[PDB]
Amino acid sequence: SMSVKKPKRDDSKDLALCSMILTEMETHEDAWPFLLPVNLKLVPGYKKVIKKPMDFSTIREKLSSGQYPNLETFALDVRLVFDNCETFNEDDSDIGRAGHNMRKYFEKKWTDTFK
């Protein structure tokens, strides 16, 4: 509350560490469904169904331009990529499987880097 603060967690390396995690997600072999925005002219249903599209390149640009106020807003967009994937793709599809794999990969890196 006012003039009563918990001890200051050092957040000065968060930017660089989110960038490193993002690099590792970008270079994973199962990243291909997620690298670029879904083409809303060419994929029927996407525009109407997925209210907040998100992809790694869009996260990379937001990161690079100071549009994440903190590491939690970064994690929300990464998770949004996988939540969108599950909304639109069957679990038993290549893309559906890609999404589950990448989410697992991301969540371990997240815990190991910050928890």
UniProtKB/Swiss-Prot annotation:
Residue span(s) of domain Bromo: 9-113
Compartments, as annotated in UniProt = Nucleus
Describe tissue expression.
Expressed at varying levels in several tissues, whereas a smaller transcript was expressed specifically in testis.
Q: Which domain of life is it from?
A: Eukaryota
Which Cys pairs are S-S linked?
none
> What function is annotated for this protein?
Regulatory subunit of the ATP-dependent BRF-1 and BRF-5 ISWI chromatin remodeling complexes, which form ordered nucleosome arrays on chromatin and facilitate access to DNA during DNA-templated processes such as DNA replication, transcription, and repair. Both complexes regulate the spacing of nucleosomes along the chromatin and have the ability to slide mononucleosomes to the center of a DNA template. The BRF-1 ISWI chromatin remodeling complex has a lower ATP hydrolysis rate than the BRF-5 ISWI chromatin remodeling complex.
Q: According to its UniProt record, which protein family does this protein belong to?
A: Belongs to the WAL family.
SUBUNIT field? Component of the BRF-1 ISWI chromatin remodeling complex, at least composed of SMARCA1 and BAZ2B, which regulates the spacing of histone octamers on the DNA template to facilitate access to DNA. Within the BRF-1 ISWI chromatin remodeling complex interacts with SMARCA1; the interaction is direct. Component of the BRF-5 ISWI chromatin remodeling complex, at least composed of SMARCA5/SNF2H and BAZ2B, which regulates the spacing of histone octamers on the DNA template to facilitate access to DNA.
| Full protein name | Bromodomain adjacent to zinc finger domain protein 2B
Please name the source species. Answer: Homo sapiens
Q: Which gene encodes it?
A: BAZ2B
Q: Which residues of the full protein are shown?
A: 2054 to 2166 of 2168
